[PDB]
């Protein structure tokens, strides 16, 4: 019954190497350990994904390319652009190994859920929801989330994927847009010019998967209360109509106030309520991380959320640890919302919640 | 009579190495060259800044540290955090050399203006306006803009610094907040949570420098027309009151639609009108780059602006070149505004323009 925590000194070390989020993995684990939360979880060393496992979603052409440029970090290969490598996804050397490590980590987590070893499995270094079968995207080289869902499909009939990252979980939605066995629900910022550009409330999936994709477009400045209202309202309807047997939850912390992307204005507490609502379902749940570009805040958030998973209330004072100075000058766990407008007009949110409730009536 | 273009294969190669903007320098030069604009300018190889020149603004402690961690890229030094190194400014190896190269490049540009070798000198790889005397900040390790201004002070009485980057030019404003010989004018996004957090219309400089700092806080979604109105209105008043003898202009392209920061909604044309207004003053002008996180767009913008400086109108079709594949899949030079709201309420803009006009009445 005790939560599984996917961890390994070598794993964290590899994650610390990702271009867009250096050292973040260490800070996250470090703060979690500093709060002694790892002592209340079952630590499981992750296995690296095999070429075969990764190939259950990603094409051989793409995988071969990734592995090739990963050799010595060839960031000048002429075919990389077609495979999504570039500014957002540089071909840093060893990247294939890191991607395989992250994919393996999420797969290990799903396997633990399948083996009844736990009801909740955590992989804070996962959540790279933007990767396509044959293309890297949005700091994502491999879609571990998809790999995890595929693995869970071996035992569970219906998987509910909930993406609370700031960005649309397009990669995952994509992978299952034609499936009715996996439903994807994503809350994200939707505004012309904002990556990835997809995920409007009108996007509901294709073919047999029509209506099995849910998108909640949100504007800048949303805070804890309104956000939870939206999330709860949508999740209540989804649960009722889809009746999932397992859940994969992505919790990108780039929605938290203080993030350099400065879009949403959430605090770990608001995301916590969403987490609690999903956990009260008592289903096998695979917890993933994702975005989060204010490193200290991301660690603050996932540490707090780990506490929520453990039903513990953490001390407000950041305990001394390797990265203590990174929590100055207040040195506290709580995060305060920024003093800026919530651009979300109530009537629009209402409009969106209904359009969704309508779409869900078709799910039987 | 003909514009000076600071360029050197070795220089561009070094700039391509900056963490937050890999290859951008090459793409910019490459597109400029692909339009054959370099043939219409006087190419000047930049000199690297000496420890003495950099020390005219930066403290020895900071400079020593930068050079030390730059040796092998020590990103674990215990003192780096105090010197601003970290997430935004990683201690990538060789960084000291790149910073010195950029600083030298802007210094070389100013020297050219001083020697009457030209009326306009360009250093698209410069514009790192956030660096403090003893601290790295916002992707900036050395404040080349400040070094350039200091150099120009050897010959010109009053220098007008105009920062059109998306972010507040805090480093530069700082360096001269107590000076009345250098006036800083910055148009930028100002919103709680948005870096760097300074630059409100009420910030006007300190001591003898009071009223010699101008800040124009702007909200998301501003477009070409309204932006130019604001810029012209402010520059008209500043010119009249300060009567500059030389101008340093920062043109960070992170205000252009398509930038991942997705804040302003400008096109290179709008920025161009601002440029034209400054150029019609007929003063020694040092052109710098800056932010710009959509690499292709940044190259598009500065290439277009280089054309404006040369009084040429460029072909809409992107000529084939080394990074030709980077402008896919359309291949045109023009940029289109995103379909999102201009959050700038007219009465507030009016309110701001007036407070500024009032502040400037004190400049004599």
């Amino acid at each position: 019954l005790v939560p599984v925590y996917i961890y390994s000194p070598e794993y964290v070390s590899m994650c610390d190497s990702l271009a867009k989020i250096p050292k973040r993995a260490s800070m996250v684990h470090s703060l979690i350990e500093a709060y002694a939360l790892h002592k209340q979880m079952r630590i499981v060393k992750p296995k690296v994904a095999s070429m075969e496992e990764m190939a259950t979603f990603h094409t051989d052409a793409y995988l071969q390319h990734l592995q090739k440029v990963s050799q010595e970090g060839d960031d000048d290969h002429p075919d990389s652009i077609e495979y999504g490598l570039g500014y957002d996804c540089p071909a840093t050397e060893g990247i294939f190994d890191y991607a395989a490590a992250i994919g393996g980590a999420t797969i290990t987590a799903a396997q633990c859920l399948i083996d009844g070893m736990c009801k909740v499995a955590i992989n804070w270094s996962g959540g790279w929801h933007a990767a396509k079968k044959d293309e890297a995207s949005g700091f994502c080289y491999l879609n571990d989330a998809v790999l995890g869902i595929l693995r869970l499909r071996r035992k569970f009939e219906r998987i509910l994927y909930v993406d609370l990252d700031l960005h649309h979980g397009d990669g995952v939605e994509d992978a299952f847009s034609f499936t009715s066995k996996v439903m994807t629900v994503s809350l994200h910022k939707f505004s012309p010019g904002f990556f990835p550009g997809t995920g409007d409330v009108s996007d509901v999936g294709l073919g047999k998967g029509r209506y099995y994709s849910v998108n909640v477009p949100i504007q800048d400045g949303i805070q804890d209360e309104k956000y939870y209202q939206i999330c709860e309202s949508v999740l209540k309807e989804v649960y009722q109509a889809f009746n999932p047997k397992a859940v994969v939850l992505q919790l990108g912390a780039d929605t938290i106030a203080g993030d350099p992307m400065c879009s949403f204005n959430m605090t770990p507490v608001g995301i916590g309520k969403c987490l609690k609502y999903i956990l009260q379902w008592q289903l096998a749940t695979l917890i993933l991380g994702g975005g989060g570009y204010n490193l200290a805040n991301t660690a603050r958030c996932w540490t707090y959320l780990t506490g929520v998973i453990l039903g513990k209330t953490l001390s407000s004072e950041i305990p001394d640890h390797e990265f203590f100075t990174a929590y100055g000058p207040d040195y506290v766990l709580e995060i305060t919302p920024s003093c800026r407008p919530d651009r979300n007009e109530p009537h629009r949110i209402q409009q969106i919640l209904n359009y969704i409730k309508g779409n869900l009536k078709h799910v039987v | 009579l003909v514009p000076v273009y600071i360029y050197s294969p070795e220089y561009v190669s070094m700039c391509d190495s900056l963490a937050k903007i890999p290859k951008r320098a090459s793409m910019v030069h490459s597109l400029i060259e692909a339009y054959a604009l370099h043939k219409q300018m006087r190419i000047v190889k930049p000199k690297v800044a000496s420890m003495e020149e950099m020390a005219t603004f930066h403290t020895d402690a900071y400079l020593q540290h930068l050079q030390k961690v730059s040796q092998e890229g020590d990103d674990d030094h215990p003192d780096s955090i105090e010197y601003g190194l970290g997430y935004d400014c990683p201690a990538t190896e060789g960084i000291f050399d790149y910073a010195a190269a950029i600083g030298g490049a802007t210094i070389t540009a100013a020297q050219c203006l001083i020697d009457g070798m030209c009326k306009v000198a360009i250093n698209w790889s410069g514009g790192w306006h956030a660096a403090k005397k003893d601290e790295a900040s916002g992707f900036c390790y050395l404040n080349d803009a400040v070094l350039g201004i200091l150099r120009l002070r050897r010959k010109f009485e009053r220098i007008l610094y105009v920062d059109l980057d998306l972010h507040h030019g805090d480093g530069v404003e700082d360096a001269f907040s107590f000076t009345s010989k250098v006036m800083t004018v910055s148009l930028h996004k100002f919103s709680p949570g948005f870096f760097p957090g300074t630059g409100d219309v009420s910030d006007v400089g300190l001591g003898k420098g009071r009223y010699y700092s101008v800040n124009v806080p702007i909200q998301d979604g501003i477009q070409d027309e309204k932006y130019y109105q604001i810029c012209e209105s402010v520059l008209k008043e500043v010119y009249q009151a300060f009567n500059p003898k030389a101008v340093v202009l920062q043109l960070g392209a992170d205000t252009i639609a398509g930038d991942p920061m997705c804040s302003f909604n400008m096109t290179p044309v709008g920025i161009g009108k601002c440029l034209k207004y400054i150029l019609q003053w007929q003063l020694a002008t040092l052109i710098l780059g800056g932010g710009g996180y959509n690499l292709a767009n940044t190259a598009r913008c500065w290439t277009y602006l280089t054309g404006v400086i040369l009084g040429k109108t460029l072909s809409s079709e992107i000529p084939d070149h080394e990074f030709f594949t980077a402008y896919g899949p359309d291949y045109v030079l023009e940029i289109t505004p995103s379909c999102r709201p201009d959050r700038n309420e007219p009465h507030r803009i009016q309110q701001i323009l007036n407070y500024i006009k009032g502040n400037l009445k004190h400049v004599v």
Partner: peptide, 4 residues
């Protein structure tokens, strides 16, 4: 294609 967008930039993140």
């Amino acid at each position: 294609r967008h930039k993140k």
